[PDB]
Design a protein around this ligand. Structure first.
Ligand SMILES: CCCCCCCCCCCCO[C@@H]1O[C@H](CO)[C@@H](O[C@H]2O[C@H](CO)[C@@H](O)[C@H](O)[C@H]2O)[C@H](O)[C@H]1O
Ligand SMILES: CCCCCCCCCCCCO[C@@H]1O[C@H](CO)[C@@H](O[C@H]2O[C@H](CO)[C@@H](O)[C@H](O)[C@H]2O)[C@H](O)[C@H]1O
Ligand SMILES: OC[C@H]1O[C@H](O[C@H]2[C@H](O)[C@@H](O)[C@@H](O)O[C@@H]2CO)[C@H](O)[C@@H](O)[C@@H]1O
Ligand SMILES: [Cs+]
Lengths: 221, 232, 121, 232
């Protein structure tokens, strides 16, 4: 239920030839819930612990999505961090998995970023009125969201009629539990330059290049 | 059959802790009644029929402990050291208050027997009804009641603590979450009477009256406690 | 051709399977139609035009067709007459003449969803 | 195994209320017998063997309550607040009449013991056999019997009330409908004896004789009540 007790769980699992948690560290989407758990100070604390997980050899240095997914779906790691979309691939594997609340840190819970999957039309396109018909009458319908969700789940769909089937899902509860603990991303144009700054800051700290105090300094400017 | 259609009852199969508990419950309502002495003569036969009401009263109580338990085990169907540990305690308490209730319901049935004007039998059988004994009564029974509800609150908390492992859907959470609050609102009145008595403000029967008056005002005081949490 | 007229809410597909077994033992095609407003399209079309060979509908409209003279008098042999109930034959009788073969007894029922409403009104 | 082949037994699986009830039933026929005192000497050993008949008589009674219950739970397999509520009551009653029966069957076994000429032991042990005590006997036991049957009637009515929810076919209805009438014809004799006694016409033993004579004439009086409902 807390991040501070994962290193202990890794010692217990490494004795039996298994990992504790493998997740895509390369993308800052996945390291953010821990980094922004307490909050600056909160980020220093949040990131310093993540560095210690790799420093103690509990997590691998170049942990990407492919090996993190495969490891949990094979049964080599007892945990992994991913969104609704990844469940369909676990269902393919013979794994009795559960989706739960992210681990807390320094008391306050992990605040992940809440993506709102969206669909927009391009400006330089002659098929503007043809794509509109598709998004409304064919895709964002009872039937259209089923065909996509059954392939690879979306999460809590925006459609009001799907509230019944969403509530019935125990995984949507764990996802929505983490969303109310977290916050939605601001759409602003500076997210690209921000996310790039966080992506580099985590990679420099994970590989062993820049210090945690020097990461926030460079990432603020 | 079911309270909630949106809840998936996991303990539909009868387990050892359900089967065990049942036995320990049966013996409460059975031995409360049959702990009595065998009517040997008509005189004793009509005496033992005065006791039907005390047990009617008590057994009604004991089936409600069983029914709030039946539902919890039906719901989550837990069978771990913590559920076991709590269950043990829930029953331990029922059992230690089995005959004490028999006495209270005998004592209250003689008090009420005189008010309606059915009987006028003496209460010197029950002993000296002093302030301290009447205060101990409120603190004694109030504790057992706080305790039984507190355990249900804790057993439903065990379910919420293992919500992800049991696979509790959005609808199943709100039931667990509410069933904690429901058992805690229920364990707040017996805690309040117990607290009021223990502090003893008036230093006389005015203390025992108030404490007894909170069990009549169970539903209205349940709404007062509930409205303060919704108003904020 | 053996054309039958029966409402669209009934089992015309299942009736045609009896019709498909009838053409096997004789050779007469059995098409089954389900037109809209067939209770009021039958007396107009059958009088002037050809209409359907046989008609299936609740017995209440059948007294209206016998008086107008749009139904042949039924003459069922006793061996078959006994296979059905006696009171059922009374519902398909007008002026002491059998005007139809009774199929089944219907009645409105309260259909309820046990998931949304366990104890209904 | 089954009474009716055209009935679909829904409660084939053993439930908590079946499992619970069983325990409460076992303790009736067990503690009725074993509530006795431990033969410490041969004198007490031969004394306790005089009691085999009273319990034989009573236990036979108690297994018939269990067997009319086993069948009902086997049939509908209900497990709701009303069935629970009634079941509770059915047993409550069995339990309150467990030892009183033990006494009546001891009392009747000494009355019958002298008629056949097996024993000539005194009945001053049971107390003063006056009109009022013998009337109270008829009203007491007659009530328990009316009550036990009345509950089965009401429990089978709960099944008919939920006939559409249980999915009761045409054949299953006539069983429920008849099993209400069957438990109500059964609860009409003990109601009649109880009523005749309570009114007390003759003001003497002629009242107690008639009331006792209706339990001998159970089958013929069941047919008299039944023929009036069919003749109209
Ligand atoms: C309202 C009207 C009903 C008032 C009921 C009051 C019950 O009061 C209660 O009576 C029973 C009568 O058996 C007495 O009971 C006494 O006799 C019974 C005889 O079976 C013994 O089992 C019991 O051990 C003994 O205490 C209790 O000591 C008294 O506390
Ligand atoms: C027909 C022949 C059989 C007649 C049986 C009459 C039974 O009569 C009954 O006898 C038993 C003999 O144990 C007496 O029983 C006495 O001794 C038994 C010894 O085990 C004790 O458990 C019991 O508490 C006590 O009442 C009853 O007080 C009397 O009511
Ligand atoms: O990692 C930074 C990246 O995070 C978010 O991207 C998520 C996206 O929300 C999901 O759809 C999923 O596919 O994973 C991505 C992370 O790998 C932001 O949307 C994106 O702007 C940001 O760069
Ligand atoms: Cs004893």
């Amino acid at each position: 239920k807390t991040w501070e007790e994962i290193p202990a769980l890794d010692k217990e699992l490494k004795a039996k030839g298994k990992s504790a948690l493998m997740f895509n560290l390369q993308e800052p989407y996945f390291t953010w819930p821990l980094i922004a758990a307490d909050g600056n100070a909160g980020a220093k604390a949040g990131l310093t612990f993540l560095v210690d997980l790799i420093k103690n050899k509990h997590m691998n240095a170049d942990t990407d999505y492919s090996i993190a997914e495969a490891a949990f779906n094979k049964g080599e790691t007892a945990m992994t961090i991913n969104g609704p979309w990844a469940w369909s691939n676990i269902d393919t594997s013979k794994v009795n998995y559960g989706v739960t609340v992210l681990p807390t840190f320094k008391g306050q819970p992990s605040k992940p970023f809440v993506g709102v999957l969206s669909a927009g039309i391009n400006a330089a396109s002659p098929n503007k009125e043809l794509a509109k018909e598709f998004l409304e009458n064919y895709l964002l319908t009872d039937e259209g969201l089923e065909a996509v969700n059954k392939d690879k789940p979306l999460g809590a769909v925006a459609l009001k009629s799907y509230e019944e089937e969403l509530a019935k899902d125990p995984r949507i509860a764990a996802t929505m539990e983490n969303a109310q603990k977290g916050e939605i991303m601001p759409n602003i144009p500076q997210m690209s330059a921000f996310w790039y700054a966080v992506r580099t800051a985590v990679i420099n700290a994970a590989s062993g290049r820049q210090t945690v105090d020097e990461a926030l300094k460079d990432a603020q400017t | 059959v079911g309270l909630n259609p949106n809840f998936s009852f996991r303990g539909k199969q009868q387990t050892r802790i359900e089967t065990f508990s049942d036995a320990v419950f049966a013996l409460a309502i059975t031995l409360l009644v049959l702990s009595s002495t065998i009517p040997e003569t008509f005189e004793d036969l009509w005496a033992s029929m005065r006791d039907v009401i005390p047990f009617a009263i008590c057994v009604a109580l004991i089936i409600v402990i069983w029914y709030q338990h039946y539902i919890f085990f039906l719901k989550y169907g837990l069978q771990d050291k913590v559920t076991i540990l709590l269950n043990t305690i829930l029953l331990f308490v029922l059992l230690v208050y089995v005959y004490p209730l028999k006495f209270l319901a005998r004592f209250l049935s003689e008090i009420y027997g005189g008010i309606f004007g059915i009987i006028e039998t003496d209460l010197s059988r029950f002993g000296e009804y002093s302030h301290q004994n009447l205060k101990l009564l409120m603190v004694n029974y109030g504790l057992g009641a706080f305790a039984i509800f507190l355990v249900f609150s804790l057993m439903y908390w065990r379910a919420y603590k293992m919500k992800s492992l049991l696979d509790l859907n959005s609808y199943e959470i709100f039931d667990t979450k509410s069933s904690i609050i429901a058992n805690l609102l229920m364990c707040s009145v017996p805690l309040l009477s117990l607290i009021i008595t223990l502090i003893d403000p008036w230093g006389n029967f005015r203390t025992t009256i108030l404490s007894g008056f909170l069990y009549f005002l169970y539903v209205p005081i349940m709404i007062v406690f509930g409205r303060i949490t919704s108003k904020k | 051709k053996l054309v039958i007229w029966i409402n669209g809410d009934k089992g015309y597909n299942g009736l045609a399977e009896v019709g498909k077994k009838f053409e096997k033992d004789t050779g007469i095609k059995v098409t089954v139609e389900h037109p809209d407003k067939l209770e009021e399209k039958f007396p107009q079309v059958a009088a002037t035009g050809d209409g359907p060979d046989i008609i299936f509908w609740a017995h209440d409209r059948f007294g209206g067709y016998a008086q107008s003279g749009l139904l042949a008098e039924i003459t069922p042999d006793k061996a078959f007459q006994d296979k059905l109930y006696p009171f059922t034959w009374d519902a398909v009788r007008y002026n002491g003449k059998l005007i139809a073969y009774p199929i089944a007894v219907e009645a409105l029922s309260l259909i309820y969803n046990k998931d949304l409403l366990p104890n209904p009104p």
